[PDB]
Amino acid sequence: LIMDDLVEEYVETEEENLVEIVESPSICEGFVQASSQTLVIIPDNERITSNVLTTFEATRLVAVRAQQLAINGSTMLKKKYSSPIDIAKQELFNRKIPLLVMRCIKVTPEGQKIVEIWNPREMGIPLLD
Amino acid sequence: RKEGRIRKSLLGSQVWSISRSTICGNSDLHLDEVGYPISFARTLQVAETVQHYNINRLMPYFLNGKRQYPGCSRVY
Amino acid sequence: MAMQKLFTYIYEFIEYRKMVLLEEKVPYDKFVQMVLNTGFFRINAETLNHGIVSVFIFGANGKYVHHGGDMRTLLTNTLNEKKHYEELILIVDKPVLSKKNILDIIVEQRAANPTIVINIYPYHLFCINIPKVSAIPKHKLITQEEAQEFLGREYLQPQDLMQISASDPPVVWLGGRPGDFVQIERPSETAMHAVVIRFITKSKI
Amino acid sequence: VGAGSSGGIYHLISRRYGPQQALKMIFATQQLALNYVRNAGFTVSTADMLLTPEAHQEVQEIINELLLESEEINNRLLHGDIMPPIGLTTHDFYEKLQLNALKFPDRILKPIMNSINPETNGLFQMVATGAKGSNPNMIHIMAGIGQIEINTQRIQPQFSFGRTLVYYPRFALEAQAYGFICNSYIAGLTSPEFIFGEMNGRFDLINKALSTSSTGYANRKAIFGLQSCIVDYYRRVSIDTRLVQQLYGEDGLDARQLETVRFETIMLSDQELEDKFKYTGIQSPLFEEEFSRLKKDRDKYRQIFLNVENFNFSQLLTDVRQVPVNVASIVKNILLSSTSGVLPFDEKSILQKYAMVKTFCKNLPYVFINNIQERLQTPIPVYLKRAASLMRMLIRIELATVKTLNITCEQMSAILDLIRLQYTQSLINYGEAVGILAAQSVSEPLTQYMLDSHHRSVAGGTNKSGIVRPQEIFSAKPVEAEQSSEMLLRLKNPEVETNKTYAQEIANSIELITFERLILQWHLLYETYSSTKKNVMYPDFASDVEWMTDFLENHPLLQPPEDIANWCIRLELNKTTMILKSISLESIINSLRAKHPNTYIMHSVENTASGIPIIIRIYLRESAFRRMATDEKIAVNVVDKLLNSTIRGIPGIKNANVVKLMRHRVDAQGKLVRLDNIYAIKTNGTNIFGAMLDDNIDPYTIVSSSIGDTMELYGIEAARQKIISEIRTVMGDKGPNHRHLLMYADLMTRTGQV
Amino acid sequence: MSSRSGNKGIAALALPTSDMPFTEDGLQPDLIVNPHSHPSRMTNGQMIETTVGLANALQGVVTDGTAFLPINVQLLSERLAQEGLRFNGCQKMFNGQTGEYFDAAIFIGPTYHQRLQKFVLDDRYAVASYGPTDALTGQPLDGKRSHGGLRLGEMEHWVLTAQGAMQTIIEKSHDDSDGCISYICRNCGEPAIYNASHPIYKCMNCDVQADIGMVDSRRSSIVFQHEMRAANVNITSVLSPRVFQPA
Amino acid sequence: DFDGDQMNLWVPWSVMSRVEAELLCSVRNWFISTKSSGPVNGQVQDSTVGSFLLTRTNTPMGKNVMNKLHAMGLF
Amino acid sequence: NRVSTQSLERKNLLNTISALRTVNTHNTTNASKQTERADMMRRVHASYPGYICVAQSADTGEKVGMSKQLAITANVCTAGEVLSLKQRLLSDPAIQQLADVSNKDIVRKGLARVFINGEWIGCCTNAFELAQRYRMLRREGKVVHPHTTIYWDSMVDEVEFWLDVGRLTRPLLIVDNNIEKYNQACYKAAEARKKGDKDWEKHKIPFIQNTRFTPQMAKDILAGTLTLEDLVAQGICEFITPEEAENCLVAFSIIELRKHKHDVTRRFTHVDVPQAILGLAALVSPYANCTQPARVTYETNQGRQTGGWYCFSWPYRVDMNRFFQFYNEMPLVKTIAHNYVIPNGLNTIVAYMIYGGYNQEDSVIVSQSFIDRGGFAGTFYREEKVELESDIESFG
Amino acid sequence: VFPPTDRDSYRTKRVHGSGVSLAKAFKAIFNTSVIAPIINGFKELLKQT
Amino acid sequence: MKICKACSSCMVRTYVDGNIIFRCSCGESVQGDSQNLLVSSKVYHTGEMEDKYKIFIKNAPFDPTNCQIKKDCPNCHLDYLTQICIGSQKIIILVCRCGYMSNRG
Ligand SMILES: [Mg+2]
Ligand SMILES: [Zn+2]
Ligand SMILES: [Zn+2]
Ligand SMILES: [Zn+2]
């Protein structure tokens, strides 16, 4: 009985050189749950990130708005359009998009999330064309 | 290994709604345009939701169905 | 030969460290003869803090680089002298580093005296004016408060920065202790020179 | 109009009107060209590649001249006239001479162009216009294939001992036996020419298949090492939260938004800079300060990029840089569209235009932060003030007062607002996976490295074949694992550095000469020495006492010790090697006794007549055989440690050649001239520490190809710069942008170790 | 299609006999080969075969063009000339679409061409949004033969990541692949049981203090974590903490 | 090239993917090479020589000129 | 498993014949590791010419150079009558057996070790003369079989006789000369010079080397009266193995032999026919010496994939993925390969022109009329075979 | 004094087709699937009788 | 090489103490005087061009595949000689079937 089509064999050859008494409490250790964070919004005069939307952020805004226009139907465009993509794009260009860009720069160990909330209607818009 | 769970199923995937074919030259297409055979265009579909702003536009697609192109065969 | 280069660039190093020599500079012949017979040459310098720095230049085939008992004796006799002892510098040949016994000696003596700093360096770290090398960009230590304000603007912990070893030649010539910040003016082929700040870690060996 | 042509018309259209207009103009011009050939017509014919009988009679004459030179080399070999250079064997030199003899001269194009009507020749037009093909393809098709080179050497005799093929005799000296193809493709190769061509043809097919697989392993390793590098909201590059780069490219710019412009003030002398850039229309201190700031920018550019020249092998200074904005074009466009002509002299406007340009340069780093902090004039970080230093230079050069005289104040504000807009559009985006971009942009040129590997040598000391060098950089192999280590030593003093004769002798002095190459035979004997009272010696070497007695009285200072062991090594010297490299008998003995103090030395006298061997007998002491193994195992080990003893030179330096450099230097008048009369030593093998010890070699400008030795000797920062240089040398001229090399180096060196 | 000199070519045009270019004598091609295929590939054998075939068709002969047989391109061109054609094989050719003669004489002649057995109809494949799926990983089966699949491997993901894509990666890797939805207790970090139709909301780790969160995932990832857990290494997902703006 | 190469093609259907595809991943963004900072595309083969033939001064017939009808036909 | 297998893909009869003429090294367990070895075993070796097709190889991937093809005239020998040759060698007075000479005699008398099929039996005083005499005997062909391999290793002075199976051999036309008469004339001229004769050049005859093949035997071969068996019997040609090939100096063509007909410095033992160095599929390419060799390899790959009459018994077969092309044509410029395999393809009028830019990057513009008329048209066949699992299943 | 054997020279290589390869495979298979059946059958026969 | 006169076995060297005394496994000793003191030796660029190619040179005039040149043989006055190239030194040797050897080799 020639079987053939063997499952081979697999070999790993390397080493991972990853460079007060105590007992078992259940509350001092463990706690897989992470502490709830508090949102610190950096004041509008202390924001040091770009006031021009990146192509990534502008694309994300347009995509989110287009999806929400696919589920909803409300908009502020005087010129009506037949596609949610067009409506969202013109909403971004006309500076009437109902979305905010939150840029997170910190995770403080005290459970503090420091963010900069940027208004796309006041921001510069990249090429996108 | 390459055929393992991580490299084959996690770091990559088999996907739906994808087509493969031989490429060929068409000097009458723009650099940002691709020639898609109608057999593949009727196979792959684009999901357009029905709203007030597009219901007029999507009606010719809905009325054609499988019978004529452009058409559609699926409604959620 | 190597020892002449040490004999010039160790006083280059002392002058760069803003230290004043505590002894009259002996000539080269007496230097080499003393390193041959005694096995070491002790150079004393004082910083603006008025701490004491001692530099030891061991011979290539001396006693203190083969047997650890004499090394212990030298360290013990030195550290209970009436000196401030900001830092002690030991210069040995490169293969002397790879011999584990003297490393054990220096580790245990570092443990014995925690307030002072003892470091061992190979010869090549003092056989050239290290800051003046073309390949080495300009390094300088920044004070704690200016580094802290830079971190506060950047919202960074000191451990988030790029790391530099305290045994790095430019850092050694700067005398940067672990946990301090060194600013580097690297020449750049993209932006025509840039500035980074690195974090000094524990010195290798 | 070609694809990939930097500075071409489509690249310029993209810069001014966006990449979408560039694509449209590519298609519009493509249809314009194709429709023209729809009436003009284009073709290639068998007669397009056919030489005239007169030209074919001249192609043969050229080839016979090559084969005549090859036979002239052979006739030297027959009479023993081939004297190889020091360091090369005769066979290595003979092969090197032959490969130079069978090189097609530039005149081989004369018969081809005599037989070609360039206005109508389809094959020539495709090659000459860059549509497809190159000059070798035209020469191969029409003139002759020439020498077939496999790994920069001729066809090796693999058929048998001394035979390359069954069609050629053993030890054949004709160039045809070793791959020299005389026919052209259109003439038709013969049976052995086709076999040699198939050896080259298959060897190219093998390299392709290796290239796909070899780069696949490197690409995946490079991706995973670098993928976690992501640009954060400060435009730094950080793994999670640990910094890898203070700013993405050290300028924070996307590689797709870079333009190559020329900095005009780099090469100008002090007087010529004053002529072109000093403004004298207004007698104000605002313009003497402006010129000094313009000269200060030039001095900083020179100092930095002369330094880059100093720690690299052949990285010349250039006045062309990649900048986000081409300020010259913006000025050119505004001046073209300006309704006004040569503006009337208005002192207020000229001073005010200077004020807004000076203010624009002062506020330039704020494009990295935002307009809000720019309005509040908050402090700028030091690294952000450096990122704009290069762009500030170009603005102060292009917008100099002597250049914007005809630009009105209103247009000046429009120009400045245009620069800020184009600078903001060029900044890298937050959240871009720039580590993956570097991995993709460095991996692709490695594929061509394998195809080009057939053009690189394989022999040791220069093992740059295939992936050997790229693995050494990327896998951080130590100094001992380097198979292509090199150093570049600059002779101390600049005036003596210009002399070739002084260069060649210092190269020999620093080369490592050990005992083994000074000896042609040595013998280990089981005998001791108790002066001339006991004797007992080996029979053949018993005659040595005729000079040992001479040594005993000529050197009474060091008599045989009281602990001579019953062992001895007798060594003879190759006087010709001593004559060749100028090691005297005095230097050998002095260095041995200083290095070996458990051995005792006897030697003959070197001034003897020709043919008389110089004899060195070493005698072991009891300390050797007292300080597991038998005595003869120790004695055999004594032979090796004596044979490998360093007599002269820096350890680890195998060879030391003399190479001419190209270095820029500043004159007394301030001009930056490129010199070709500078000589320096390029050595096989690396020892930075030894070269620093050497006083005839400048210690500050030492350059090594070893990342490991650079790291140990210089530090993490020179190691980081070494990684960029080492990849760049591997990458080639077509290699990627410089910011992709920074991404590799900053990742590897982010922890303080490579 | 391919020539005997080794010049592969994918046919992309079907011109009618009126749109084909033709010579003064009415001869028109079957294939139109780009002249740029020659100079870099150096397939001179095809051109020489074209010349000899041009001479052969008029003489009604079939010549032996075996390799290494003596060949003189000059004499074959002179044979062409003696046959009534030009020294080169070129002819006065007219554009079939517009009737305008080309300025240059076009090299047209018989070349032996081979149809390689790589049919586009076999190679082309298109799949819809649904079909056979792998029982284990929940992904589409592999390839055309299984009536579903086609793979976006590691390199496609790397390229999309380099483009900063996402969303497209989300769509292709989750919506058009084994995209499932996973539940984690957020209190123990272990997978939990949630169902809205049947009102079950529980985890077996800490039951009464369960805080099931909804985590987007892939069935391949869940299978991978189950395989790891079966290997007796426990996997706990911390889950992102909730953020609350100050009152 | 067109020697038998096969390339995958999938049409986005999700609105988020479709918005993304045209705004971010359009080929106009890859005209300039990220690797080399230069353009990727241009004229190749049939047009590189076609641009030379169109723009050269003298044809073998004479000066490289065309009448109005054939100048119009180029467009 | 040392059985080199391959599924019979009937793309065309050329593919089948090439498959049955394929030599595979077939990497076993402990295969090629990352070294120079994976490159060298794929390179064209200097011993390949005449036995292994220098051109034929896979042009893609791992199989490049892995699979080799027999040349057009190469043949694989079977095991010969080893016993008869061994007995003749033992009965030879010039060979001293092992039992008669010791190792001290071997080195002190300079005896040359004689081997047959690797079995060291006997020793000889003159290895060269022994090998030449037995080569002459093989040329006579009555006592020594023509397929025996007589190899003389002049580096160690050993004469090896090989008769085992698996020896690739090809017939090579023997070249004879007058070196004996030339040497006699040279010695006579030397005697005249020594005696001081003024016209010593009348005593030097020219060197003449030539094969015995004559155009009349070419006509006889084409007429069918003369075969290779007769050519070997008549001493015109002989079979040469890669072992013996190192003892042969071969003129690559009759042109090279004719050029050096009076060159005493080039004394060829055999004369080659240049078409012998190529395989069957490589010879399909016309004027392949003018083409770049890599393109010839590409043709070897593409010739075996070409559509055509894949099997003359196709209507009786139920095969999968088999394409039968209706119309086939002999090339106008045919090669020798088409004497043995039917041609696959058509003589297509092709124009090398720029036409609308639809043929860039090795694309082809095809006349739709040529397609409609039957150009490269045919039938593609697929099978659907299903089987009943047990009595529980049936067709209906 | 002598170089190693050329791993790719065809003088030291043989080509084995059909007859030889099938001979080796057949001897192994005949052993396993003929001798061992007979061997075990005879062992059991001696057990029974 | 020392072989036991009784056991015909290889004897160790055993340098004890001031002399060389060979010893067999059978316990016999034979000692050694003068010419036994050569423990080890190495001669550079020797053992090449004499012993490696002697047979090849001897057989070269009889090898059909060896390259030949037009040069008079001093001994037998044959118009052709056999040309031989050996070594990385590329030493050219002309040999003839009459035994003439060019005194080189
Ligand atoms: Mg392709
Ligand atoms: Zn739970
Ligand atoms: Zn014994
Ligand atoms: Zn002679």
XYZ file of N, CA and C in Angstrom, chain A residues 33-101:
207
model
N -11.320 44.089 32.576
C -11.997 45.332 32.237
C -11.047 46.514 32.354
N -11.030 47.354 31.326
C -10.233 48.569 31.357
C -11.036 49.709 31.968
N -10.342 50.564 32.715
C -11.001 51.692 33.355
C -11.592 52.621 32.306
N -12.814 53.084 32.559
C -13.465 54.001 31.636
C -12.649 55.277 31.505
N -12.427 55.699 30.270
C -11.625 56.877 29.994
C -12.497 58.122 30.032
N -11.868 59.258 30.303
C -12.534 60.548 30.245
C -11.968 61.345 29.081
N -12.853 61.959 28.307
C -12.460 62.636 27.079
C -12.057 64.069 27.394
N -10.797 64.398 27.142
C -10.296 65.756 27.289
C -10.170 66.359 25.901
N -10.980 67.371 25.623
C -10.968 68.043 24.332
C -10.025 69.231 24.429
N -8.962 69.206 23.632
C -7.976 70.289 23.672
C -8.632 71.579 23.199
N -8.440 72.701 23.892
C -9.119 73.939 23.501
C -8.717 74.384 22.104
N -9.641 75.086 21.444
C -9.464 75.434 20.040
C -8.219 76.271 19.792
N -7.702 76.955 20.808
C -6.492 77.746 20.651
C -5.227 76.984 21.011
N -5.346 75.759 21.515
C -4.192 74.940 21.851
C -3.985 73.785 20.885
N -4.750 73.724 19.801
C -4.628 72.635 18.846
C -3.429 72.871 17.940
N -2.566 71.864 17.828
C -1.343 71.962 17.046
C -1.339 71.035 15.845
N -2.460 70.404 15.528
C -2.539 69.572 14.342
C -2.983 70.408 13.149
N -2.792 69.851 11.956
C -3.069 70.587 10.731
C -4.532 70.991 10.651
N -4.767 72.231 10.238
C -6.113 72.727 10.006
C -6.619 72.384 8.615
N -5.830 71.663 7.826
C -6.242 71.167 6.520
C -6.490 69.673 6.641
N -7.653 69.225 6.185
C -7.960 67.805 6.218
C -6.980 67.029 5.351
N -6.502 65.906 5.872
C -5.751 64.986 5.040
C -6.693 64.306 4.054
N -6.124 63.807 2.955
C -6.938 63.070 1.996
C -7.614 61.880 2.656
N -6.936 61.248 3.612
C -7.544 60.164 4.371
C -8.764 60.648 5.143
N -8.620 61.752 5.881
C -9.722 62.243 6.704
C -10.870 62.759 5.851
N -10.563 63.472 4.767
C -11.620 63.937 3.877
C -12.355 62.766 3.240
N -11.614 61.745 2.806
C -12.246 60.563 2.235
C -13.123 59.861 3.260
N -12.648 59.757 4.501
C -13.443 59.127 5.548
C -14.714 59.915 5.825
N -14.612 61.244 5.873
C -15.796 62.071 6.077
C -16.806 61.858 4.963
N -16.338 61.874 3.714
C -17.251 61.710 2.588
C -17.885 60.329 2.612
N -17.101 59.294 2.920
C -17.636 57.937 2.945
C -18.680 57.774 4.041
N -18.390 58.295 5.235
C -19.331 58.191 6.345
C -20.616 58.939 6.020
N -20.487 60.155 5.484
C -21.669 60.933 5.144
C -22.473 60.261 4.043
N -21.797 59.670 3.058
C -22.502 58.994 1.978
C -23.245 57.766 2.485
N -22.641 57.012 3.402
C -23.351 55.874 3.977
C -24.558 56.331 4.786
N -24.399 57.399 5.569
C -25.524 57.888 6.356
C -26.616 58.473 5.472
N -26.249 59.018 4.313
C -27.241 59.427 3.329
C -27.852 58.235 2.618
N -27.167 57.095 2.625
C -27.771 55.873 2.113
C -28.797 55.313 3.084
N -28.589 55.496 4.386
C -29.585 55.038 5.352
C -30.631 56.116 5.635
N -30.219 57.369 5.795
C -31.141 58.486 5.949
C -31.379 59.127 4.582
N -31.961 60.323 4.562
C -32.118 61.047 3.315
C -32.018 62.553 3.450
N -31.699 63.034 4.646
C -31.702 64.462 4.929
C -30.355 65.085 4.589
N -30.399 66.251 3.949
C -29.193 66.948 3.534
C -29.473 68.442 3.472
N -28.414 69.211 3.228
C -28.497 70.660 3.120
C -28.125 71.166 1.735
N -28.171 70.309 0.720
C -27.781 70.707 -0.626
C -28.975 71.308 -1.355
N -28.852 72.577 -1.749
C -29.872 73.182 -2.596
C -29.943 72.476 -3.940
N -28.788 72.165 -4.523
C -28.726 71.431 -5.781
C -28.857 69.946 -5.476
N -29.979 69.355 -5.869
C -30.210 67.947 -5.590
C -29.350 67.072 -6.497
N -29.028 65.878 -6.004
C -28.203 64.921 -6.724
C -28.828 63.537 -6.634
N -28.474 62.684 -7.591
C -29.031 61.341 -7.668
C -28.183 60.292 -6.962
N -27.025 60.664 -6.422
C -26.149 59.694 -5.789
C -25.702 60.197 -4.424
N -25.696 59.330 -3.410
C -25.227 59.762 -2.087
C -23.773 60.176 -2.080
N -22.954 59.574 -2.941
C -21.547 59.951 -3.026
C -21.418 61.404 -3.453
N -22.177 61.799 -4.477
C -22.146 63.183 -4.937
C -22.648 64.135 -3.863
N -23.721 63.761 -3.165
C -24.268 64.629 -2.125
C -23.246 64.833 -1.015
N -22.615 63.747 -0.565
C -21.622 63.860 0.496
C -20.412 64.664 0.041
N -19.970 64.452 -1.200
C -18.816 65.184 -1.706
C -19.100 66.679 -1.772
N -20.268 67.056 -2.297
C -20.604 68.472 -2.375
C -20.865 69.064 -0.999
N -21.372 68.263 -0.059
C -21.517 68.734 1.312
C -20.161 69.046 1.921
N -19.163 68.204 1.650
C -17.811 68.498 2.117
C -17.251 69.748 1.448
N -17.439 69.879 0.134
C -16.887 71.030 -0.577
C -17.598 72.319 -0.194
N -18.909 72.258 0.025
C -19.679 73.440 0.389
C -19.624 73.743 1.876
N -18.920 72.925 2.656
C -18.695 73.171 4.079
C -20.006 73.157 4.861
N -20.803 72.116 4.636
C -22.034 71.906 5.387
C -22.195 70.437 5.742
N -21.097 69.783 6.104
C -21.129 68.368 6.465
C -21.382 68.261 7.967
N -22.339 67.439 8.398
C -22.674 67.380 9.826
C -21.804 66.414 10.610
N -20.505 66.409 10.340
C -19.586 65.477 10.968
C -18.417 66.252 11.547
N -17.837 65.715 12.611
C -16.663 66.301 13.232
C -15.523 65.299 13.196
N -14.311 65.811 13.040
C -13.112 64.987 12.998
C -12.457 65.063 14.367
